[PDB]
Amino acid sequence: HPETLVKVKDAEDQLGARVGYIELDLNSGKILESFRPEERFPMMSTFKVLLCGAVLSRVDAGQEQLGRRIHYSQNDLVKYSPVTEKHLTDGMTVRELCSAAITMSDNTAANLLLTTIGGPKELTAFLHNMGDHVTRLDSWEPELNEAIPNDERDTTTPAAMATTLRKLLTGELLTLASRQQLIDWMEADKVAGPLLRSALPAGWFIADKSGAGERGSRGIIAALGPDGKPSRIVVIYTTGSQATMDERNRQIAEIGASLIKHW
Numbered sequence: 001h002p003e004t005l006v007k008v009k010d011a012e013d014q015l016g017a018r019v020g021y022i023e024l025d026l027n028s029g030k031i032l033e034s035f036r037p038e039e040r041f042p043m044m045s046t047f048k049v050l051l052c053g054a055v056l057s058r059v060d061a062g063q064e065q066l067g068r069r070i071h072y073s074q075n076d077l078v079k080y081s082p083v084t085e086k087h088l089t090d091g092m093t094v095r096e097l098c099s100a101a102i103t104m105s106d107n108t109a110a111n112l113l114l115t116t117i118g119g120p121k122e123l124t125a126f127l128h129n130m131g132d133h134v135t136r137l138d139s140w141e142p143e144l145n146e147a148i149p150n151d152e153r154d155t156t157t158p159a160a161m162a163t164t165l166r167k168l169l170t171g172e173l174l175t176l177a178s179r180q181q182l183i184d185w186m187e188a189d190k191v192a193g194p195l196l197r198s199a200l201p202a203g204w205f206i207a208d209k210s211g212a213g214e215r216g217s218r219g220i221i222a223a224l225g226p227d228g229k230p231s232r233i234v235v236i237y238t239t240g241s242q243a244t245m246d247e248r249n250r251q252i253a254e255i256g257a258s259l260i261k262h263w
């Protein structure tokens, strides 16, 4: 809706950074609204949803089990790993790792899951193999690149990410069970409260994943809708900014308030 683009443009000026935005109809996959849809932005933690998509694809092929337990040690821990930090003694199953990587943006959880599939290169291969030749993960956490446009490592575009997310939540790429599990983990997201969720009315459904960069980049991918069910996919990314985190969060929340008001 035009009013949402107003807030997106306001955000660019307020943040002194570029903002990428796209909203897709969940059923048809058609672009309902967009801004800088084909420009590249650092994916940051939003890649964790795609990673678990790759893991679920392996589960569907009988190459992985959600209940499989992975043991690890202190040497595997990296910053921003609130859940994995507490399971050095008993380990965590694959589903617990995806839950942690998605809902708490747990870095070590993401790395352990990356290891199960063969590394960043295999996540990129997984994406390439499903028709996404844009999105690329080149690094392990906590080292993702943010230096665009010179360096395109670890980037995506609003359009590529939205299209890919839709292909992981709908259609036949993943089984019904896997599609449902992926959106269920996203619905349980615990660290995206100041973003789209802050503007969400009671009774609305939202399944999302946030991202943040050391240089100030911020982003979010989501499937949301009224009456307790999702009907649109929204992806929002912002380049590096000198603006404070509170300000970055507020701008994204403002965009969401408009999206909701003019649904």
Ligand SMILES: *[B]([O])([O])[C][N]C(=O)C1=C([C])ON=C1C1=C(Cl)[C]=[C][C]=[C]1
Pocket (backbone or CB within 6 Å): 044, 045, 046, 080, 105, 107, 210, 211, 212, 213, 214, 215
């Ligand atoms: B992912 O992007 O969510 C993982 N990384 C971060 O969240 C992050 C980065 C890249 O730089 N700081 C953070 C961070 C923030 Cl802003 C809040 C809480 C934990 C980590």
